[PDB]
Coordinates of C-alpha atoms and ligand atoms in Angstrom, one line a residue:
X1 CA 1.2 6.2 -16.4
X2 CA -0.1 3.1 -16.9
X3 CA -1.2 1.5 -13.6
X4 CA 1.1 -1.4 -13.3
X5 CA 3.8 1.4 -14.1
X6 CA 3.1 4.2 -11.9
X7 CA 2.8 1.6 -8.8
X8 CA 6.3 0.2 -9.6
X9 CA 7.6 3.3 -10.5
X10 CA 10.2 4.0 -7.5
X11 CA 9.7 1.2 -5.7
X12 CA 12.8 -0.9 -4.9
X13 CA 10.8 -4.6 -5.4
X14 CA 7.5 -6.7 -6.1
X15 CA 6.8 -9.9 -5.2
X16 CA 5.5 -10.8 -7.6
X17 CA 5.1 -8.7 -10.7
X18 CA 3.0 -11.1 -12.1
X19 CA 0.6 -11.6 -9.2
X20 CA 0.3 -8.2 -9.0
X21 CA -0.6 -7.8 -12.4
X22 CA -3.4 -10.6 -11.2
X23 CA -4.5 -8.0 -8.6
X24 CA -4.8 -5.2 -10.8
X25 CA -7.3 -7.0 -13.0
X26 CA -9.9 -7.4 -9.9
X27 CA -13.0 -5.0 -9.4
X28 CA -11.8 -4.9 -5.6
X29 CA -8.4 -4.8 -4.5
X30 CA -6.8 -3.8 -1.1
X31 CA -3.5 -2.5 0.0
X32 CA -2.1 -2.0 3.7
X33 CA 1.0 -0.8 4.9
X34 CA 1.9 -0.3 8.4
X35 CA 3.7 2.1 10.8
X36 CA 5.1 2.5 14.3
X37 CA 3.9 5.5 15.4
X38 CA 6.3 8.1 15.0
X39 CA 6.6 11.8 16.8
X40 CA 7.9 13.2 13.5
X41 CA 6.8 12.2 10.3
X42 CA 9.4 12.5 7.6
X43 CA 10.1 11.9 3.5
X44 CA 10.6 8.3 4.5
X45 CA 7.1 7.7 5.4
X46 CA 6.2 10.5 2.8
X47 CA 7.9 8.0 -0.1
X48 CA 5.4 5.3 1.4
X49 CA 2.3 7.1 1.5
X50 CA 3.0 8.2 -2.1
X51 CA 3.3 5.1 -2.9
X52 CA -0.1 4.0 -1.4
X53 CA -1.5 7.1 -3.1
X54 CA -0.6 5.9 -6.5
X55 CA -2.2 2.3 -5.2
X56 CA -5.0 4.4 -4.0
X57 CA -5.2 6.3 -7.7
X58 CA -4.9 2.6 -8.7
X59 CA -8.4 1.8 -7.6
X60 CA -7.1 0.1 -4.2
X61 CA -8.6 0.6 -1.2
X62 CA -6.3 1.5 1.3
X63 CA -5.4 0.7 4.8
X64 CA -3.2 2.0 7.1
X65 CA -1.7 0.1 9.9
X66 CA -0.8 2.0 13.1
X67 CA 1.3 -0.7 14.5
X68 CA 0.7 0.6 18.6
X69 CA 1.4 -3.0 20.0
X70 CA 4.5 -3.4 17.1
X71 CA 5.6 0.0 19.0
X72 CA 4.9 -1.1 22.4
X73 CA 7.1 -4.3 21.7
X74 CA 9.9 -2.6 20.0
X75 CA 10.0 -0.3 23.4
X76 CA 8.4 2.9 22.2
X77 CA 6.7 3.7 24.9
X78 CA 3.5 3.2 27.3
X79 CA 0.6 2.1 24.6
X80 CA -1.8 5.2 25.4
X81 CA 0.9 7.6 24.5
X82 CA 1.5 5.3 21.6
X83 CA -2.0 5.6 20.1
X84 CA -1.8 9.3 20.5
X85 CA 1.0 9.9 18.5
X86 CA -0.5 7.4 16.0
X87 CA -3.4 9.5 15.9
X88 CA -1.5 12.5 14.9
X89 CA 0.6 10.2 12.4
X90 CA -3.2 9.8 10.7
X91 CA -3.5 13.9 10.6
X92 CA -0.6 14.1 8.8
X93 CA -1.3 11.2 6.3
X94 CA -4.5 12.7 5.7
X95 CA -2.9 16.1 5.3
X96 CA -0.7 14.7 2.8
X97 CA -3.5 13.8 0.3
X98 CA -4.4 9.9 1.2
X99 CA -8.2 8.4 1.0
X100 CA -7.5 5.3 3.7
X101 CA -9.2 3.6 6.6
X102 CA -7.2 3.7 9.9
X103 CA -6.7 0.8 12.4
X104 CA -4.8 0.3 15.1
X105 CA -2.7 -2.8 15.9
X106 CA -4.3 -3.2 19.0
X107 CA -7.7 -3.6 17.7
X108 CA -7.5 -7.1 16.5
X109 CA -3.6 -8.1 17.8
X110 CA -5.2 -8.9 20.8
X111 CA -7.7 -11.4 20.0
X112 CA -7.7 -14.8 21.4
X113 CA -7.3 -16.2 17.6
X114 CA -4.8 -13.7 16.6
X115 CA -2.3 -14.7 19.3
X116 CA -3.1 -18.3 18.9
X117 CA -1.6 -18.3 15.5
X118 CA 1.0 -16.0 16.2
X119 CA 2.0 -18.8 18.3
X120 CA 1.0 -21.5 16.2
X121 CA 3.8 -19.2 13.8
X122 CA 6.0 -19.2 16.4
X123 CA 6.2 -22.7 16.5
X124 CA 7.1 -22.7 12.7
X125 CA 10.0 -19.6 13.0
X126 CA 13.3 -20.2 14.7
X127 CA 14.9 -17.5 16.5
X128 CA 18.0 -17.1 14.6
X129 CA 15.5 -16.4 11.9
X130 CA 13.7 -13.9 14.1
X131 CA 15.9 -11.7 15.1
X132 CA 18.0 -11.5 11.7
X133 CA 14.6 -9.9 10.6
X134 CA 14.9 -7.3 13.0
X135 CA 18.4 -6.2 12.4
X136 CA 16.7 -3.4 10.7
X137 CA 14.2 -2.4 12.7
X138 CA 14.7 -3.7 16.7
X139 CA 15.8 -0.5 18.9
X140 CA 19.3 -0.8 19.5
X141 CA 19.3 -2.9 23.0
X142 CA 22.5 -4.3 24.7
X143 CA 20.2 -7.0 26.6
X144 CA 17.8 -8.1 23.5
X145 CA 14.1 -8.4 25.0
X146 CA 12.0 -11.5 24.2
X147 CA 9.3 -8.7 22.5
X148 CA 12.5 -8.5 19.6
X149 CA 11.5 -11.8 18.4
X150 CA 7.6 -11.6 19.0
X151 CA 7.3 -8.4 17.0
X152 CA 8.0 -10.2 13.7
X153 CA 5.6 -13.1 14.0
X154 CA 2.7 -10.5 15.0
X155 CA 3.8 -8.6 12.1
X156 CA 3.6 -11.7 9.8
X157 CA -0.1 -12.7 11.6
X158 CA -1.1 -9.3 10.3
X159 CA 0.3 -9.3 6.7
X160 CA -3.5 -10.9 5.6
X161 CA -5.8 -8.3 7.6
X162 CA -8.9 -8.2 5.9
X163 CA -7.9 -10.0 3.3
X164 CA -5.4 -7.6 1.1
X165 CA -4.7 -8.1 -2.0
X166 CA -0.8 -5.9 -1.2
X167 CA 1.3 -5.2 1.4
X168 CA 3.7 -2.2 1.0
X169 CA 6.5 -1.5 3.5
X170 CA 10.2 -0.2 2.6
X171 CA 13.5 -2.6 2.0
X172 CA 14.4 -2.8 5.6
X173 CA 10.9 -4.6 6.0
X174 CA 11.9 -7.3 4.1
X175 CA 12.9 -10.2 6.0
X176 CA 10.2 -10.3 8.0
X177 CA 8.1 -9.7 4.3
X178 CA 10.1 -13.0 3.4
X179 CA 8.8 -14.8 6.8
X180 CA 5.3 -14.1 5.9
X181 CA 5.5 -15.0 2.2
X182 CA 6.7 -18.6 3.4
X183 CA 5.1 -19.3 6.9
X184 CA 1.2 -18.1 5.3
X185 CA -0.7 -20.0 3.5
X186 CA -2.3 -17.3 0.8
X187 CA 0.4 -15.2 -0.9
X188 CA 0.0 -11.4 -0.9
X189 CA 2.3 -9.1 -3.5
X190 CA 4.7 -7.1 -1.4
X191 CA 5.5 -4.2 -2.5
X192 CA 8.9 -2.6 -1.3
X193 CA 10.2 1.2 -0.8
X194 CA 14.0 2.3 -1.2
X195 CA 14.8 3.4 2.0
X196 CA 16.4 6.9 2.2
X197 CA 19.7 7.8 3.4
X198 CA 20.1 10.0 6.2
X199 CA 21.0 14.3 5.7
X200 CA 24.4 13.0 6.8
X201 CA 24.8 10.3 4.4
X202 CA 25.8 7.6 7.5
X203 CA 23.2 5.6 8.0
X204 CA 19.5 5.7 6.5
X205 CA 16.8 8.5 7.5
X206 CA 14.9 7.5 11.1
X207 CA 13.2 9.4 13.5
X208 CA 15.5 8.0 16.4
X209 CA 18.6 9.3 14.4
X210 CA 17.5 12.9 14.0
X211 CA 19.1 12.6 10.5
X212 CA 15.5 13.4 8.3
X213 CA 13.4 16.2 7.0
X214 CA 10.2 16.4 8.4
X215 CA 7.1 17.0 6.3
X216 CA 6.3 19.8 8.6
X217 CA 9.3 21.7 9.0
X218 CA 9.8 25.3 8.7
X219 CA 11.3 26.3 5.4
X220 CA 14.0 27.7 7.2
X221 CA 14.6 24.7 8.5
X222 CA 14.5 22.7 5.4
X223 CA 17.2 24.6 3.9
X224 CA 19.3 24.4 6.9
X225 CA 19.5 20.7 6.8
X226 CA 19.8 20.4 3.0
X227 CA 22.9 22.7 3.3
X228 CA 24.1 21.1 5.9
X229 CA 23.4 17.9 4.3
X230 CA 25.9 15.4 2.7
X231 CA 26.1 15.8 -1.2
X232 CA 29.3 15.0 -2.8
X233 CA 30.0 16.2 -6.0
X234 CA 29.8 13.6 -8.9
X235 CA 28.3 10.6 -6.3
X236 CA 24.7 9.6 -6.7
X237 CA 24.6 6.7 -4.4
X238 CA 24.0 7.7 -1.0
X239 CA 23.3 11.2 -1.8
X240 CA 20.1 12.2 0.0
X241 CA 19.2 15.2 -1.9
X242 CA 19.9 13.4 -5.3
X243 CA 17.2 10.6 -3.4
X244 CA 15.1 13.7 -3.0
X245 CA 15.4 15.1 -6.5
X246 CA 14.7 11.2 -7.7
X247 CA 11.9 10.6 -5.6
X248 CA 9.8 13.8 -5.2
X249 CA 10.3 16.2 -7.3
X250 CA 8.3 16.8 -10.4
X251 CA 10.3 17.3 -14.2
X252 CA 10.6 18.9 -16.1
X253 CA 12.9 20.4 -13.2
X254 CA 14.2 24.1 -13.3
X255 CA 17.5 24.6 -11.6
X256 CA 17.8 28.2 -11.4
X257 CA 21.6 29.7 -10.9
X258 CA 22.9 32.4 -11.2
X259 CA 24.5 33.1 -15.0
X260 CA 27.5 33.9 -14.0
X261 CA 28.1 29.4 -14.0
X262 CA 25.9 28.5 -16.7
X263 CA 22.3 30.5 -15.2
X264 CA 19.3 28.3 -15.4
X265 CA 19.3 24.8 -16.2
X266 CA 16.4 23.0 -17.2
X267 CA 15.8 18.9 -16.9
X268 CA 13.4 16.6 -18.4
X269 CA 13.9 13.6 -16.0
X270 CA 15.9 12.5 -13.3
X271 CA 18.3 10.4 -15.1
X272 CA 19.5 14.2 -17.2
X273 CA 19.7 15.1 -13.5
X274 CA 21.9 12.3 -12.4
X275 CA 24.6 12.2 -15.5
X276 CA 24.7 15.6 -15.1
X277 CA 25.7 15.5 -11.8
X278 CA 28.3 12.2 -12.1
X279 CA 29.9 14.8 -14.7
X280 CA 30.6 17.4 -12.2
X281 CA 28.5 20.0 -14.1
X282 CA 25.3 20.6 -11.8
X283 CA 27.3 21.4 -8.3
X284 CA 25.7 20.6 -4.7
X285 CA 25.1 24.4 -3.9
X286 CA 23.1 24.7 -6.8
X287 CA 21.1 21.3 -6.5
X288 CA 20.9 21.9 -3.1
X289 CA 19.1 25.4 -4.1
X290 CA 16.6 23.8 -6.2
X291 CA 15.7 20.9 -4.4
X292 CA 15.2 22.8 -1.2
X293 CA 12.9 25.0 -2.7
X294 CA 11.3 22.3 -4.4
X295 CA 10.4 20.5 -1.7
X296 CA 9.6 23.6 0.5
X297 CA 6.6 23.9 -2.3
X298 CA 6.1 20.2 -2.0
X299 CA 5.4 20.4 1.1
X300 CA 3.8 23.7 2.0
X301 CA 0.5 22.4 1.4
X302 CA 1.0 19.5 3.9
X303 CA 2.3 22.0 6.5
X304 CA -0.7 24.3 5.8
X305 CA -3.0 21.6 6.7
X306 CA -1.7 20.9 9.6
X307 CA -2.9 24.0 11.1
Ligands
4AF401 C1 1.0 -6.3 9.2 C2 1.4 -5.7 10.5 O1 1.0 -6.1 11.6 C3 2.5 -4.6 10.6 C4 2.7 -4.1 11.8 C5 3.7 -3.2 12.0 C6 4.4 -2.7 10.9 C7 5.4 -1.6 11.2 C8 6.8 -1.9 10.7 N1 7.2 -3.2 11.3 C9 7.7 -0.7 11.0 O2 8.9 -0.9 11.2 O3 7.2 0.4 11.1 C10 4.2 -3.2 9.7 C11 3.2 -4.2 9.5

């Protein structure tokens, strides 16, 4: 629980530990994380805004980035129908417990002195480099636009908005975290999120790839895709429900069954969780039970909010 802890705990990397432990001794400190829009909001940007409410529990003020313009360049959409959906995004964060100031990209992207160091940056980052930092994130395009190799830079440009103290953003953010950390003159400690592996197991959770839970789904729902979801017995890595069982749900854990093979199982941690799975002795049906109904309580309240 203690602070420098609880903000690592889950997280995949920080650069730097140590300047983090810097920021944690300040009276103020400030943490942003951004997000294209989304028209579903899902455990992947739940994992994040967890994270930022532990930073927020932390004593950070928080920002949240609703990256319209990042959208608009990455082909989302018209920007008005952009912002709206971003809007929406900021219901849900709200309805999932965070204490943050909103801002849209667009609100300072634009600015005369913003662009004119985004291409004073652009100047300073080859394209090679560019668009390896987008492998991760640039909408699958058969033609690659020139806006695939802008994005980044902006994003860089807007790493040190209001002067934060953090950036968070998941592993696939990292290269273009790694841009920043060089190109920029003040370093800020990034802070990275595991990204979660699709319901299928194929590729990782996105909102394009229909392969993620939704905070907002109906429980019905919820256990439809966790049953239909990959979860090989005995294999941790790139099991999504084990990823949800790591990452979401509290211990000590209670895995009902039924008595008839073994009857309920109780688990202090995770890592009991995980052996016991690698042995073959909790099986996907029943861990499939008790995550689904864990996360249906998880996130009731959030659905509740939301009307
Ligand atoms: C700092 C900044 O401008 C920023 C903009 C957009 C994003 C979104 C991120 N690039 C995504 O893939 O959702 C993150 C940070």
């Amino acid at each position: 629980m203690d602070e420098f802890e609880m903000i690592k705990r889950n997280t995949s990397e920080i650069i730097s530990e140590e300047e983090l432990r810097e920021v944690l001794k300040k009276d103020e400190k400030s943490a942003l994380i951004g997000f294209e829009p989304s028209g579903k909001i899902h455990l992947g940007h739940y994992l994040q805004i967890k994270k930022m409410i532990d930073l927020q529990n932390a004593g950070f003020d928080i920002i949240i980035l609703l990256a319209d313009l990042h959208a608009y360049l990455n082909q989302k959409g018209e920007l008005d129908e952009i912002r709206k959906i971003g809007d929406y995004n900021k219901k849900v964060f709200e309805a999932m417990g965070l204490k943050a100031k909103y801002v849209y990209g667009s609100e300072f992207q634009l600015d005369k002195d913003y662009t004119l160091n985004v291409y004073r940056l652009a100047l300073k980052t080859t394209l090679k480099r560019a668009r390896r930092s987008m492998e991760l994130i640039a909408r699958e395009d058969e033609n690659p636009k020139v806006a695939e190799v802008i994005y980044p830079i902006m994003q860089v440009n807007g790493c040190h908005y209001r002067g934060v103290d953090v950036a968070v953003g998941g592993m696939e953010q990292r290269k273009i975290h790694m841009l920043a950390r060089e190109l920029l003159p003040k370093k800020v400690v990034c802070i990275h999120n595991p990204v979660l592996t699709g319901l299928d197991g194929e590729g990782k959770m996105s909102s394009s790839k229909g392969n993620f839970i939704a905070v907002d789904d109906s429980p019905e729902e919820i256990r439809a895709k966790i049953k239909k979801a990959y979860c090989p017995a005995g294999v941790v890595e790139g099991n999504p429900i084990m990823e949800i069982a790591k990452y979401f749900l509290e211990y000590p854990l209670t895995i009902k069954r039924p008595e008839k093979f073994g009857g309920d199982l109780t688990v202090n941690s995770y890592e009991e969780l995980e052996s016991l799975f690698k042995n073959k002795e909790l099986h996907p049906m029943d861990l499939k039970n008790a995550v689904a109904e864990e996360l249906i309580k998880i996130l009731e309240p959030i659905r509740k909010r939301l009307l």
